[PDB]
């Protein structure tokens, strides 16, 4: 709930689970990877692109 209310972003989505119910799901050993690319290269950033 602290991901969209203050300010929207370009694209928010999740794979294998609805992003709306991130609260009830319970993960383990969460990593955090971040970087900066061109906006045109966003489509390359997908599970099943190149």
């Amino acid at each position: 709930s602290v991901l969209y209310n203050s300010a929207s972003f370009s694209t928010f989505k999740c794979y294998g689970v609805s992003p709306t119910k991130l609260n009830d799901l319970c993960f383990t050993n969460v990593y955090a990877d971040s970087f900066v690319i061109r906006g045109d290269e966003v489509r390359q950033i997908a599970p099943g692109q190149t």
Binding site: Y4, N5, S8, P19, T20
Partner: protein, 50 residues
């Protein structure tokens, strides 16, 4: 049970009022059926008998 009516889905906050913007999506989604696709991705035709 069968449902026919199509309404724009709302995801969490930001009520849509039938605009399909952020966190709003069209309820249905099409296919990519082609013979060139994989064997699993090929369309099968189902006839249930009850």
């Amino acid at each position: 049970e069968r449902d026919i009516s199509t309404e724009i889905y709302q995801a969490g906050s930001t009520p849509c009022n039938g605009v399909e913007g952020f966190n709003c999506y069209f309820p249905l989604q099409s296919y990519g059926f082609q013979p060139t696709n994989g064997v699993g991705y090929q369309p099968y035709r189902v006839v249930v008998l009850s």
